[PDB]
Amino acid sequence: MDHLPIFCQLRDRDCLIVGGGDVAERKARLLLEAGARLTVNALTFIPQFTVWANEGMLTLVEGPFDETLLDSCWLAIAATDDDTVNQRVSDAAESRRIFCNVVDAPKAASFIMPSIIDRSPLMVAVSAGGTSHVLARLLREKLESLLPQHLGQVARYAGQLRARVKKQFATMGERRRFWEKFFVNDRLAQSLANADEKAVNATTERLFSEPLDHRGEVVLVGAGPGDAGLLTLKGLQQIQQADIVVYDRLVSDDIMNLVRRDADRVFVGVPQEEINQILLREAQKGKRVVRLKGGDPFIFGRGGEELETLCHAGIPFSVVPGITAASGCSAYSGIPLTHRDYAQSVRLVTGGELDWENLAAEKQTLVFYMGLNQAATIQEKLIAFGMQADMPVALVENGTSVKQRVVHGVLTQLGELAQQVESPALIIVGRVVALRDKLNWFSNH
Amino acid sequence: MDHLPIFCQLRDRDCLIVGGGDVAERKARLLLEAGARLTVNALTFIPQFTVWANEGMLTLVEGPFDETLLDSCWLAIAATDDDTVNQRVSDAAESRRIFCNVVDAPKAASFIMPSIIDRSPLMVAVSAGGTSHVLARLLREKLESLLPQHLGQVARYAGQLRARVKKQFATMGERRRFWEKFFVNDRLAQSLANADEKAVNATTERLFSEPLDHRGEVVLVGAGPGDAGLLTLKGLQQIQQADIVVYDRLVSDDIMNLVRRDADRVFVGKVPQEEINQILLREAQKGKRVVRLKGGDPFIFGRGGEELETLCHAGIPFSVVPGITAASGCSAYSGIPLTHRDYAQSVRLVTGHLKTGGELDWENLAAEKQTLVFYMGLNQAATIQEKLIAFGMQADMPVALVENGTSVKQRVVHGVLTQLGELAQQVESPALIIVGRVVALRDKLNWFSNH
Ligand SMILES: Nc1ncnc2c1ncn2[C@@H]1O[C@H](CSCC[C@H](N)C(=O)O)[C@@H](O)[C@H]1O
Ligand SMILES: Nc1ncnc2c1ncn2[C@@H]1O[C@H](CSCC[C@H](N)C(=O)O)[C@@H](O)[C@H]1O
């Protein structure tokens, strides 16, 4: 222990920042978020300070550092580019026993500012003694990804409720198991954040009526197309809380590596009815169920079918969208789905029968899902229905993954090019495909 | 934020604890480890306070509270079981502008003491503000299984190298590139943990020897439609490490709160497009890691292509992190799947604002078995209704408008196609128009809110 972390209550307390440039602006922003009664003293100010001053948010004192400005101070920050001024600030603060930070000199004064993860009233702070700002930031990034955005809502609502939980639960063992379920109920958190009382109270005494061991729900989570970094923050959080993860072939190994160590896994890679009942069966055993699907759940994912099974049974559900194959393949192949006036619309199409005259019309970007089989037919029909034979085409196999393959050419070679790839692959047809020679940044295989 | 966390240097600074029971003993142990010059003022003391004052580790003042004991103090802790005494302490500390903790009353006084995870010199502090003692410990447990124990040795070694890093790398940019390699070298971490000095030195000399890439970079990052939970892990990594973030009005405040606190930020909401291109170009040429943070997905009606197409000729590295486009986010959060069973053979993402005297291909857009999603089409909703009808879309085709989709302020209105124009007057931008049979599924699949 070389530093003692404390969480200061600054609301309406006088604090002083010396300095008026970009560094001081960042510290002022932070102290204002904490409700400090802030004075800023500097020889000159960048315009953000005059804005705040004109909105009554702080006081400005233009001129040399005046150590009487510390007279009723609780905290001081020296944020100038002048070592001599910063040392004058820290000496004047030290003689008054005012905790003081010198931004460019962590061992020069009496406190250092840690990296902060804010879920107020819940807060986390990280500091390596000031000798590793990159390390503290790498930890902040991990923590920001793991703490749900609305955790603070549930933290505050916990107090509004501590009495009722003591009278329905006698032992401290059951009370702890109640808090465990309460704080990971992200649905209650989101309902609190939405200010939706009908949803809030519907979730609340469902927590008091259900037995403590029951936590039955289904979350559909979009895994994205392959790259584990394309999972959403909320997707990661949900798969870290699942009792049971139901997945298939199109969820990548990298994503599955993120699944919490002791979750049960069920591989359904199998008619849809079997899958719908698996989710129902697992949810009615009272378990927190995540159905992980490749890409986005509601784009040729049959996610709607999985959810109507559950609405029937009174099982709570939610959906976390994911990066669909079109978006992932577009970004990683350097083929934007729109560009300038090239396309008035993007068409996401599955390979009843397709309306070929419609697909052939000009000023579209066509994106075929599950169309490898019909790729010879697609070429033949588009040409017969008037698409210019020189229309650029591309096929992206295993888009966003470390084995992504991109082959490209013109419409007359589509059935040719399709044999060079296997599923999962996308076919993109449109003038945007010509941009790849300028926008290609990801390694090809 | 409720509180500002700070990490205080207490070495040789006077602190006062009032009270002498088990609570006071726990706080005194903490202050003593931090190097505080400690006085403890109490009517009675439990035995542990006798062992400490025998070894000269603190000063005991046996008796009622003496507020003059605060006169030279930097921190005060009120740890009696007498609320009247605790409040006299906190009043006396407040008059002296001394940060003061009242252990049994976290909402009183002026600082709270967090739970600590110790990987010294690395430290992680957690508190819920006293609103919930339980949540802190549940979080504390998770964070300990997350932070390897040898993280302290990595941090310790970094502190030792800091002078040499500062001497050999003249700019903050070069130093940052070194540290980013240092802190993810798993072999160095293992050698430190094993006290293998030859292996430490071999990897260290190689790290110092590596030529650094002084080129900047432009990364286009899809922020998603608003809910900060819908940023990708890679997009969070990019904004947590950017030098400068160029962003616009359709990037939500919650996502902006995830940006590196130290990054410069340039707002280009209403800046013309060719000037955005120049900002990214010149900032990357200056060697900075630039993030262009865009609403939704960068390559769907986001002009991301225009922002990139100068860069390869300029020899400036770039990449793209895709994001959740408005269609996908609004779909999920409104209960309206974009595809379902035989309802749609395709999803059409259409712009409702055209350049020139441009006309959409209404005959093509009116076809059956599709879900139409119009972006920036609010001003055109009356025209969209009339044209779709005139080219034969059924008059009772369901429609929906999602305003601020995925945000806590999201609003959804719905009806049939002959109501589209009037429905659009009920929302404001940003809003998506969804046209198609899948809109009827909302009453079954809507989970997010009814506002
Ligand atoms: N990584 C990937 N690269 C290219 N195409 C992919 C892909 N992952 C899925 N696909 C496409 O998606 C089809 C499965 S249908 C499932 C689509 C998914 N819900 C999504 O939103 O993307 C595959 O046949 C293939 O055409
Ligand atoms: N949160 C949101 N809710 C509803 N519509 C949104 C939205 N965010 C963006 N939009 C739509 O997107 C249009 C801007 S065009 C930029 C779209 C972005 N690249 C994307 O992929 O989503 C807006 O006019 C509005 O129609």
- Which ligand 1 atom sits closest to the C-alpha of A303? 19
SS3 A348: strand
- Please judge whether B332 and A317 are an interchain contact, meaning their C-beta atoms are less than 8 angstroms apart: no
d(CA A337, CA B93): 63
Q: Reduce the secondary structure of A166-208 to three states and give it as a string.
A: HHHCCCHHHHHHHHHHHHHCHHHHHHHHHCCHHHHHHHHHHHH
State the Cα–Cα distance between residues A396 and A405, nearest whole angstrom. 6
Print burial letters for A227-253: b (CB count within 10 Å at least 16), e (below 16). Answer: bbbbbbbbbbbbbbbbbbbbbbebbbe
Instruction: Give me the domains of chain A, ranges plus CATH numbers.
Output: 14-113 (3.40.50.720), 148-214 (1.10.8.210), 215-323 (3.40.1010.10), 329-439 (3.30.950.10)
Half-sphere CA count of A300, side-chain side, radius 13 A: 22
Tell me which amino acid residue A305 is. E
User: Which ligand has the nearest atom to the CA of A370?
Assistant: 1
SS3 of residue B106 by DSSP: coil
Q: Please report the sign of the dihedral spanned by the C-alpha atoms of residue A376, residue A380, residue A381, residue A382.
A: positive
Do A41 and A16 touch, CB atoms closer than 8 A? yes
Q: Which of A384, A115, A404 is nearest to A252 (CA)?
A: A404
Confirm if B347 and A298 have CB atoms less than 8 A apart.
Answer: no
Q: Are B40 and B61 in contact (CB under 8 A)?
A: yes
If you measure from the C-alpha of residue B3 to the centroid of ligand 2, how many angstroms do you get, rounded to a whole number? 35
For the CA of B252, the closest atom of ligand 2 is: 1
Q: Is there an atom of ligand 2 within 6 Å of B406 CB?
A: yes
What does the radius of gyration of chain B's CA atoms come to, in whole angstroms? 30
Q: Is the peptide bond before B322 cis (omega within 30 degrees of 0)?
A: no
Contact predicate B349/B331, CB 8 Å:
no
CA distance A56 to chain B (A): 19
C-beta of residue A226 within 8 angstroms of C-beta of residue A399:
yes
Which listed ligand is nearest to A298 at the C-alpha? 1
| Bridge partner list, A115 | A126
* Dist. CA A271–CA A344, nearest whole Å: 37
| Distance (Å) of CA B265 to CA A51, A149, B182, B219, B250 | 16, 22, 27, 14, 15
DSSP symbols for B36-97: -EEEEEESS--THHHHHHHTTSSEEEESS--GGGGTT-SEEEE--S-HHHHHHHHHHHHHTT
Which residue among A305, A369, A400 has the greatest number of ligand 1 atoms within 8 angstroms of its CB, and so is best to mutate?
A: A369
* Contact residues, chain A, for B182 at CB < 8 Å: 134
Does the distance separating the beta carbons of A127 and B155 come in below 8 Å?
Answer: no
Which residues have C-beta within 8 Å of that of residue B445, sequence separation ≥ 6?
A304, A307, A308, A311, B335, B336, B337
Decide: B370 in ligand 2 pocket, CB within 6 A. no
Ligand 2 atom at minimum distance from B376 CA: 24
Tell the burial category of B61 from Cβ atoms under 10 Å away from its Cβ (0-12, 13-18, 19+).
Answer: middle
User: Has B171 been labeled as part of a binding site?
Assistant: no
What is the C-alpha to C-alpha distance for residues B80 and B100, in angstroms, rounded to an integer?
13
- C-beta of residue B306 within 8 angstroms of C-beta of residue B273: yes
Residue A407, CB half-sphere, CA atoms under 13 Å: how many? 16
User: What CA–CA distance (Å, rounded) separates B359 from B38?
Assistant: 79
Q: Among partner residues B162, B257, B449, which is closest to A199 by beta-carbon distance?
A: B449
Question: Are A89 and A102 contacting, i.e. CB atoms less than 8 angstroms apart?
Answer: yes
Task: Report the C-alpha gap between A114 and A129 in whole angstroms.
Answer: 9
Q: Please tell me the distance from the alpha carbon of residue B221 to that of residue B304, in angstroms, as a whole number.
A: 10
Nearest to A345 among B34, B318, B350 (CB): B350
Locate the chain B residue with the closest alpha carbon to A32: B1
Ligand 2 mean position to A147 CA, how many Å? Answer: 26
Q: Is the CB of B224 under 6 A from ligand 2?
A: no
Here the tokens at position B30 are 């903490």
DSSP strand pairing (A122-127 vs B122-127): antiparallel
Is residue A75 a contact partner of residue A98, using CB atoms and an 8 Å limit?
yes
Residue with the nearest Cα to atom 4 of ligand 2?
B431
Q: What are phi and psi of B172, to 5 degrees?
A: -60, -35
**B111, B222, B354 ranked by CB distance to A344: nearest:** B354
Which residues in chain B have Cβ-Cβ distances shorter than 8 Å to A72? 97
Closest residue by Cα to residue A292 from A226, A339, A350, A347:
A226
Sheet holding B59-62, edge to edge: B59-62, B37-42, B14-18, B75-78, B99-102
Q: Which three-class secondary structure string do you get for B110-178? A: CEECCEEEEECCEEEEEECCCCCHHHHHHHHHHHHHHCCCCHHHHHHHHHHHHHHHHHHCCCHHHHHHH
Q: Report the alpha-carbon distance of residue B79 to residue B46 in Å, rounded.
A: 13
Going by C-beta distance under 8 Å and a sequence separation of 6 or more, which residues neighbour residue B276?
B246, B268, B292, B307
Fill in the DSSP letter of residue B378. Answer: G
User: Cα–Cα distance between A263 and A256 in angstroms, integer?
Assistant: 11
Residue B163 dihedral angles phi and psi, to the nearest 5°: -65, -40
- Output phi, psi for A29, to 5 deg: -55, -45
Could you tell me if A427 and A375 are in contact, meaning their C-beta atoms sit under 8 angstroms apart? yes
* Interface with chain B: mutation pick from A13, A161, A346, A433, highest number of B CBs within 10 Å: A346
What are φ and ψ of residue A121, in 5° steps? -75, -10
Compute and round to an integer the Cα radius of gyration of chain A.
Answer: 29
CB atoms within 10 A of CB A58: 18
Sheet (strand A217-222) strand order: A264-267, A244-247, A288-293, A217-222, A317-320
- Crossing angle between the packed helical segments A47-54 and A22-33, to the nearest 10 degrees: 30
Record: contact A331-B349, CB cut-off 8 A: no
Q: Could you say which ligand is closest to the alpha carbon of residue B377?
A: 2
Sheet holding A59-62: strands in order across?
A59-62, A37-42, A14-18, A75-78, A99-102
> CB under 8 Å to B150, separation ≥6 — which residues?
B189, B190, B192, B193
Output the CA A32–ligand 1 centroid distance in Å: 46
Cβ neighbours for A100, distance < 8 A, ≥ 6 positions apart: A75, A76, A77, A78, A89, A90, A93, A94, A109, A110, A111
Are B323 and B296 spatial neighbours (Cβ–Cβ below 8 Å)?
Answer: yes
User: How far apart (Å, rounded) are the C-alpha atoms in residues A116 and A7?
Assistant: 11
Query: Parallel, antiparallel, or unpaired for β B115-119 and B264-267?
Result: unpaired
Query: To test the ligand 2 pocket, which listed residue (B221, B276, B301, B334) has its Cβ within 8 A of the most ligand atoms?
Result: B301
H or E element at residue A410: strand A405-410
Please give the Cα distance from B448 to A150 (Å, whole number): 14
Residue written as token pair 């050419």: A409
Sheet strand arrangement including A115-119: A115-119, A122-127, B122-127, B115-119
The helix/strand/coil state of B232 is: strand
Q: DSSP states of B179-201 as a string?
A: HHHHTT-HHHHHHHHTT-HHHHH
CB count within 10 Å of CB B266 equals 17
Please tell me whether A39 is known to bind a ligand: no
Alpha-carbon span B137 to B143, nearest angstrom: 10
Is residue B225 annotated as involved in ligand binding?
A: yes
| 8 Å CB contact of A135 and B158 | yes
Q: Are A317 and A292 in contact (CB under 8 A)?
A: no
Query: Would you say B10 and B19 are in contact if contact means Cβ atoms under 8 Å apart?
Result: no
CA distance A57 to A62: 16
Instruction: Determine the distance in angstroms separating the CA of B328 from the nearest CA of chain A, rounded to an integer.
Output: 6
Strands B75-78 and B99-102: parallel
Å between B326 CA and nearest CA of chain A: 11
A267: left (phi over 0), alpha (psi -120 to 50) or beta: beta
Beta bridge partners of residue B402, listed in sequence order? B412, B432
Q: Which of A252, A300, A320, A372 to mutate to test the pocket of ligand 1 (most atoms within 8 A of CB)?
A: A300
Q: Using alpha carbons, select from B288, B398, B285 the residue that is nearest to residue B335.
A: B398
Please give the method by which this entry was determined: X-ray
Can you tell me the distance from the alpha carbon of B183 to that of B324, in angstroms, rounded to the nearest whole number?
31
Ligand-binding annotation for A325, yes or no, is yes
Closest of B69, B67, B71, B65 to residue B20, by C-alpha = B65
Pairing between β-strand A392-397 and β-strand A364-369 as defined by DSSP bridges: unpaired
Give the count of beta carbons closer than 10 Å to the beta carbon of residue B382: 13
Q: Which residue among the candidates B243, B248, B288, B294 is catalytic per the annotation? A: B248
Search chain B and give the residue with CA nearest A156: B131
Residue B13 in tokens = 């600074």
- Count of other CB atoms within 10 angstroms of residue A166: 10
Q: Find out whether A22 is annotated in a ligand binding site.
A: yes
CA distance A74 to A86: 17
Report the catalytic residues of A. Answer: 248
- CB distance A321 to ligand 1 below 6 Å: no
Beta-carbon neighbour count of residue A214 at 10 Å? 16
Residue A169 to residues A135, A164, B362: CA-CA distances in angstroms?
43, 9, 63
Phi and psi for A68 in degrees, rounded to 5?
-70, -15
A430 lines ligand 1 (CB under 6 A): no
For residues A34 and A28, give the distance between their C-alpha atoms in angstroms, rounded to a whole number: 10
Residue corresponding to tokens 């903050």: B172
Is A225 flagged in the annotation as binding?
yes
Element (H, E) at A256: helix A253-256
Resolution in angstroms, to 1 decimal, for this deposition? 1.9
CA distance B281 to A152: 39
Residue B108 tokens read as 């009183």
**Distance, CA of A381 to CA of B115 (rounded, Å):** 67
C-alpha span between B409 and B437 (Å, rounded): 25
